[PDB]
Amino acid sequence: GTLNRFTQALVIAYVIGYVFVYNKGYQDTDTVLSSVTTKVKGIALTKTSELGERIWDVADYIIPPQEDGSFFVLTNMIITTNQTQSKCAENPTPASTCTSHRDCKGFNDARGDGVRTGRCVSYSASVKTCEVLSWCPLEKIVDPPNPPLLADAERFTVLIKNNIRYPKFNFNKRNILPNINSSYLTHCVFSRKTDPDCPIFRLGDIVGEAEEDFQIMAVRGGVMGVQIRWDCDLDMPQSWCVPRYTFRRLDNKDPDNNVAPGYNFRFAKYYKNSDGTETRTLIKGYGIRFDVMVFGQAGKFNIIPTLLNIGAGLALLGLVNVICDWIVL
Amino acid sequence: GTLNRFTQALVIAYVIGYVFVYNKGYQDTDTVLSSVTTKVKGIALTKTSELGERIWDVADYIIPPQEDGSFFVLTNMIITTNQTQSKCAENPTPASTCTSHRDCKGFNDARGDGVRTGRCVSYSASVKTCEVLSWCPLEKIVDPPNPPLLADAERFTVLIKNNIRYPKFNFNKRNILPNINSSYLTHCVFSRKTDPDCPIFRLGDIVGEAEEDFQIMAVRGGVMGVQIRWDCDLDMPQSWCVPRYTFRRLDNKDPDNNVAPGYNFRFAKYYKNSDGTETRTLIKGYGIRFDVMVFGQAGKFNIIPTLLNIGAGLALLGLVNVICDWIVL
Amino acid sequence: GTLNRFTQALVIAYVIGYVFVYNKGYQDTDTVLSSVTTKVKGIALTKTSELGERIWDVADYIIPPQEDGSFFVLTNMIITTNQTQSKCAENPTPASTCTSHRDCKGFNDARGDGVRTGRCVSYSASVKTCEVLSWCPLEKIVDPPNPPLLADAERFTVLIKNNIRYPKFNFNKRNILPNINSSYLTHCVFSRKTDPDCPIFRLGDIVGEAEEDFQIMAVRGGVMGVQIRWDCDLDMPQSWCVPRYTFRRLDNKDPDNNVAPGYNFRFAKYYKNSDGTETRTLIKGYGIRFDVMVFGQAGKFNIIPTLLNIGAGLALLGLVNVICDWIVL
Ligand SMILES: *[C@@H]1O[C@H](CO)[C@@H](O[C@@H]2O[C@H](CO)[C@@H](O)[C@H](O)[C@H]2NC(C)=O)[C@H](O)[C@H]1NC(C)=O
Ligand SMILES: *[C@@H]1O[C@H](CO)[C@@H](O[C@@H]2O[C@H](CO)[C@@H](O)[C@H](O)[C@H]2NC(C)=O)[C@H](O)[C@H]1NC(C)=O
Ligand SMILES: *[C@@H]1O[C@H](CO)[C@@H](O[C@@H]2O[C@H](CO)[C@@H](O)[C@H](O)[C@H]2NC(C)=O)[C@H](O)[C@H]1NC(C)=O
Ligand SMILES: *[C@H]1O[C@H](CO)[C@@H](O[C@H]2O[C@H](CO)[C@@H](O)[C@H](O)[C@H]2NC(C)=O)[C@H](O)[C@H]1NC(C)=O
Ligand SMILES: *[C@H]1O[C@H](CO)[C@@H](O[C@H]2O[C@H](CO)[C@@H](O)[C@H](O)[C@H]2NC(C)=O)[C@H](O)[C@H]1NC(C)=O
Numbered sequence: 001g002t003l004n005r006f007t008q009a010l011v012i013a014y015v016i017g018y019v020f021v022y023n024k025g026y027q028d029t030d031t032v033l034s035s036v037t038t039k040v041k042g043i044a045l046t047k048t049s050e051l052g053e054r055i056w057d058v059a060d061y062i063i064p065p066q067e068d069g070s071f072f073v074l075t076n077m078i079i080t081t082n083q084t085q086s087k088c089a090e091n092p093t094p095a096s097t098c099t100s101h102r103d104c105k106g107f108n109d110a111r112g113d114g115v116r117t118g119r120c121v122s123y124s125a126s127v128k129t130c131e132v133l134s135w136c137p138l139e140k141i142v143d144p145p146n147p148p149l150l151a152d153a154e155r156f157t158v159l160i161k162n163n164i165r166y167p168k169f170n171f172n173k174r175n176i177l178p179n180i181n182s183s184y185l186t187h188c189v190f191s192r193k194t195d196p197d198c199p200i201f202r203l204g205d206i207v208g209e210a211e212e213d214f215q216i217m218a219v220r221g222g223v224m225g226v227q228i229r230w231d232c233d234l235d236m237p238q239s240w241c242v243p244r245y246t247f248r249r250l251d252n253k254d255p256d257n258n259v260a261p262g263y264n265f266r267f268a269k270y271y272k273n274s275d276g277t278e279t280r281t282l283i284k285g286y287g288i289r290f291d292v293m294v295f296g297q298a299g300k301f302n303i304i305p306t307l308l309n310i311g312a313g314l315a316l317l318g319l320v321n322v323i324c325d326w327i328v329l
Numbered sequence: 330g331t332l333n334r335f336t337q338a339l340v341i342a343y344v345i346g347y348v349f350v351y352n353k354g355y356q357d358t359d360t361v362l363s364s365v366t367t368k369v370k371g372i373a374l375t376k377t378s379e380l381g382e383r384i385w386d387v388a389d390y391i392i393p394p395q396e397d398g399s400f401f402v403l404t405n406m407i408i409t410t411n412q413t414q415s416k417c418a419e420n421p422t423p424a425s426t427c428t429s430h431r432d433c434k435g436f437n438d439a440r441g442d443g444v445r446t447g448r449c450v451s452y453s454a455s456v457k458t459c460e461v462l463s464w465c466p467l468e469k470i471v472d473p474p475n476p477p478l479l480a481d482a483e484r485f486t487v488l489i490k491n492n493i494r495y496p497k498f499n500f501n502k503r504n505i506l507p508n509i510n511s512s513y514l515t516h517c518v519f520s521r522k523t524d525p526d527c528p529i530f531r532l533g534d535i536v537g538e539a540e541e542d543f544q545i546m547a548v549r550g551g552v553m554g555v556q557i558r559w560d561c562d563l564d565m566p567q568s569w570c571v572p573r574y575t576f577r578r579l580d581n582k583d584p585d586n587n588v589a590p591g592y593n594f595r596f597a598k599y600y601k602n603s604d605g606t607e608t609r610t611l612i613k614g615y616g617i618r619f620d621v622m623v624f625g626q627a628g629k630f631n632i633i634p635t636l637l638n639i640g641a642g643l644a645l646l647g648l649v650n651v652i653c654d655w656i657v658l
Numbered sequence: 659g660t661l662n663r664f665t666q667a668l669v670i671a672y673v674i675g676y677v678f679v680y681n682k683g684y685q686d687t688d689t690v691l692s693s694v695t696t697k698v699k700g701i702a703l704t705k706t707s708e709l710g711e712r713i714w715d716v717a718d719y720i721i722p723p724q725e726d727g728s729f730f731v732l733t734n735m736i737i738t739t740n741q742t743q744s745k746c747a748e749n750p751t752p753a754s755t756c757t758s759h760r761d762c763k764g765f766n767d768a769r770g771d772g773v774r775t776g777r778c779v780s781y782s783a784s785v786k787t788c789e790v791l792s793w794c795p796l797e798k799i800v801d802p803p804n805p806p807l808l809a810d811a812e813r814f815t816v817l818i819k820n821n822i823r824y825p826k827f828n829f830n831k832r833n834i835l836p837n838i839n840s841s842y843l844t845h846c847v848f849s850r851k852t853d854p855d856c857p858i859f860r861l862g863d864i865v866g867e868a869e870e871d872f873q874i875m876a877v878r879g880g881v882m883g884v885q886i887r888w889d890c891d892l893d894m895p896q897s898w899c900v901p902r903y904t905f906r907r908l909d910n911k912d913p914d915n916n917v918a919p920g921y922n923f924r925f926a927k928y929y930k931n932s933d934g935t936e937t938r939t940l941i942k943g944y945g946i947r948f949d950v951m952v953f954g955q956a957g958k959f960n961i962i963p964t965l966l967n968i969g970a971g972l973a974l975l976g977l978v979n980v981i982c983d984w985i986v987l
């Protein structure tokens with residue numbers, strides 16, 4: 001029909017026009033094989049209450065441990081020391097509290113501060129609670145310092161390297177562009193406006209780019225997601241293949257509707273005493289774990305998907321006439 | 330033909346009926362960007378042969394190290410201590426055994442207990458073997474304790490958080506549902522029957538859910554795979570987007586057809602002696618490494634794949650007539 | 659037309675011939691769920707300048723830390739010891755150099771060797787630079803030893819286990835074949851020519867297979883990518899499903915156009931002095947990090963994609979006639 005010349009003009013503009021340049025269907029996909037490397041640099045001062053001023057080389061003292069891709073920056077802490085294998089009073093709790101040896105005797109014990117020895121002992125002159133053997137003295141139940149001890153970390157800076165490969169199209173590139181000289185990377189610092197190609201990011205600015213604050217986050221900790229996205233049209237020059245960096249808070253702020261708020265964990269330092277006995281320093285550290293999430297797809301031109309889709313274009317226009325005929329009169 | 334009205338009624342029921350509601354082809358795929366966090370809690374008692382009763386805070390003493398997603402729980406061990414840099418007798422082995430200094434002189438040495446010094450020394454009054462410098466005293470060749478030292482670990486419990494995102498559909502959710510209050514997560518424990526939405530899992534129950542046993546596995550160690558699966562139809566409410574948890578033993582039990590049976594590795598503890606000399610405690614730990622494997626796909630409605638497939642539906646029915654004609658008379 | 663019998667003979671040979679056996683479109687894809695395990699074995703001798711001959715059990719002394727999949731082998735190092743919390747002279751640098759207390763007073767300080775105390779102190783009789791509190795004595799600025807301290811590592815050997823699963827086709831296998839006895843894996847060593855099925859690889863041979871050299875790489879470090887590829891046609895016997903191993907240097911050699919050349923990082927060893935004071939040994943270690951990258955796809959037969967494509971085959975041949983008619987006369 002006369003509408004058939006209109007529809008044929010519509011489908012030609014539909015596929016070639018719509019489906020190809022917009023949806024780009026004429027290509028075959030391939031996902032990214034990725035590897036990433038990070039180097040945090042920076043140092044941090046802390047005037048501890050008693051211990052006096054102290055240094056923290058984010059290098060060695062601040063990163064437990066040195067991870068594969070991701071990584072965790074220490075920001076806050078509760079430090080218990082001179083701990084040893086010994087018996088001692090549980091922390092004051094209605095579940096731990098006792099009147100005499102009769103109350104202390106368990107599954108919950110091993111879930112709490114340590115393993116319960118039947119004996120009952122005074123947690124202080126004022127009160128009494130079940131004795132347990134454990135690492136003693138027990139860690140003091142307190143909220144983490146505020147503001148953060150390693151608040152200087154806002155200003156630490158991380159270098160992020162990222163080699164990737166699309167196995168299928170035997171192609172591979174690195175987030176560091178060849179146009180970029182080494183002397184520039186000697187002191188550049190990423191920024192969306194000025195330096196998009198600087199792979200050195202500032203921790204504060206990472207948190208911040210994410211609609212967050214390194215300071216209100218550094219107290220109780222959290223996890224920052226550093227999303228890298230590799231989209232490359234391989235039929236285009238390999239020069240136009242470029243990484244986009246996005247940022248995201250992953251942990252939940254809301255106190256309600258969650259558990260283990262923020263991000264922290266304990267680790268220790270063991271010491272062979274000159275006496276031959278064991279002692280350890282236990283440390284509950286809060287901090288920000290940065291996860292580097294890499295992803296992307298790519299595609300060159302290809303006959304099979306193209307003809308596959310074009311074919312469907314011709315079957316589609318068949319019905320287009322019935323649609324035009326029912327619409328028009 | 331008359332069969333053409335039958336076939337057209339078949340293809341309409343074939344695509345819309347079969348291919349769409351079953352195979353759901355009318356959607357576009359998107360894979361999951363994932364991050365996971367874990368918190369193991371629990372303590373464990375061990376009455377060591379000589380050393381007497383001892384505590385092991387799965388927190389600090391039990392997890393080497395504190396990993397990104399995955400994690401490894403200590404269950405069993407062989408502990409060699411007071412080790413130092415020094416010379417000493419290899420372990421009795423036909424390859425190590427010697428009659429005099431003539432036999433000891435290598436590539437295998439450096440492959441064995443330590444580097445071979447030519448001298449030959451008696452491993453005991455009864456026998457003799459090549460001297461080597463190494464960390465000495467050498468670790469005693471024995472099978473790991475049975476039952477497991479940290480058998481209490483069956484009952485440790487891990488909390489598992491999992492934030493995910495589909496980049497394409499700018500959508501993201503967390504395994505912890507909003508319907509779930511915090512006070513519940515204060516002591517809930519996952520279970521298929523009662524508490525499907527409790528993200529706190531019990532190590533025994535994880536092993537167990539996998540058709541295995543934490544006790545027969547904890548002696549010599551292994552790796553548990555905790556598979557999380559995120560399938561979401563995004564055209565449906567984001568509320569129906571939910572995680573399914575599956576369990577799997579990854580290591581091979583069979584003694585034959587494998588190497589490094591179960592799962593263990595050695596690590597050490599270094600100590601600056603008051604004398605200024607070095608000493609270390611070497612530890613071969615067996616345990617269960619839990620790998621959290623996250624994956625899934627999703628899809629909203631879309632025109633391109635739909636019309637693409639519908640088009641093929643019309644080309645398909647064309648041949649359906651030749652099939653009906655050859656069948657019927 | 660007469661050319662229509664030619665085209666129909668072309669498309670039948672085009673799809674069934676070209677698109678199916680070559681491009682294999684009649685299948686549905688599924689990507690790999692992977693887990694990997696590694697065990698490095700080997701020991702290494704080092705005749706240190708002063709300290710004398712010394713052993714390094716790649717087990718405990720050589721791997722910091724014991725990683726999930728990937729792993730890092732120590733090859734070279736700069737070792738600073740008896741470090742303590744204290745004040746001391748910065749390293750000679752035009753930015754650090756000073757004439758008197760007036761010059762020392764900062765953001766750069768905290769970026770450098772330590773936090774600047776106003777006082778100015780002589781770095782030596784010859785010169786003077788700003789005093790800072792830090793871990794002191796500062797680490798000596800030198801290039802890493804050459805040749806590598808743990809050069810013996812060329813010859814260390816790693817065992818690599820790899821369990822994988824395609825969730826969709828409920829299928830899963832392991833890089834260790836059932837045909838392979840355990841007694842063989844007791845001393846086999848991978849090699850392309852003789853032993854393709856030996857999952858024990860030699861570090862030198864890994865580097866080497868990659869068109870590189872463990873020795874010129876071990877001085878300043880780098881990252882080796884161990885690419886495993888799982889392609890399985892699941893309509894074929896599950897026996898033909900096999901892993902291919904490829905090798906790749908990931909870091910950039912070129913001095914220009916990069917930062918943090920090679921691969922190294924610092925970590926420390928803490929010691930409670932008999933005096934009650936703290937001291938630590940700081941260590942900048944160069945080495946080779948091996949990343950095990952696993953990937954692959956698979957597919958069984960399927961009706962939907964097949965008919966989808968066949969359908970497009972019939973729509974395609976429609977236009978083939980117009981092409982043959984315009985070509986031929
Ligand atoms: C090396 O690297 C930098 C970064 O690309 C170059 O600096 C940029 O170059 C252009 C052109 O002059 C300026 O318009 C931009 O402002 C520069 N970016 C920044 C943040 O400095 C620099 O030119 C290069 N050095 C040489 C000599 O090649
Ligand atoms: C908070 O969380 C829990 C878990 O969803 C709620 O307990 C469930 O709610 C229903 C409805 O009463 C019960 O039928 C299920 O047995 C409960 N699950 C378990 C294991 O307890 C609880 O109601 C919530 N608390 C409030 C007050 O909202
Ligand atoms: C156990 O494993 C090995 C490795 O597959 C077998 O050795 C191979 O078997 C064939 C057949 O004789 C030889 O042609 C190859 O040279 C062998 N490979 C190597 C590198 O040795 C060995 O036969 C097996 N042992 C038994 C008894 O089954
Ligand atoms: C940690 O440090 C101090 C100093 O060594 C310990 O001091 C004393 O505590 C002991 C336990 O009751 C007694 O055994 C000692 O005799 C006493 N001091 C001396 C001079 O030996 C203290 O115990 C330690 N704290 C713990 C219990 O972990
Ligand atoms: C580990 O601990 C003990 C106690 O210090 C060591 O005791 C002795 O061993 C030495 C090595 O032959 C001699 O050098 C010493 O004189 C002797 N004891 C004293 C009082 O010094 C023992 O060597 C250590 N074990 C090793 C060798 O690692």
Ligand SMILES: *[C@H]1O[C@H](CO)[C@@H](O[C@H]2O[C@H](CO)[C@@H](O)[C@H](O)[C@H]2NC(C)=O)[C@H](O)[C@H]1NC(C)=O
Pocket residue numbers: 740741742744794795
């Ligand atoms: C590391 O080891 C030595 C040996 O203990 C230290 O020796 C001395 O240094 C001190 C710092 O000025 C003085 O406080 C001491 O009195 C002196 N020796 C003695 C016998 O105490 C040396 O300080 C240490 N190095 C540093 C500063 O880290």
Ligand SMILES: [Gd]
Pocket residue numbers: 067068069396397398725726727
């Ligand atoms: Gd990791």
Ligand SMILES: [Gd]
Pocket residue numbers: 215
């Ligand atoms: Gd701020």
Ligand SMILES: [Gd]
Pocket residue numbers: 544
């Ligand atoms: Gd049991």
Ligand SMILES: [Gd]
Pocket residue numbers: 873
């Ligand atoms: Gd060599």
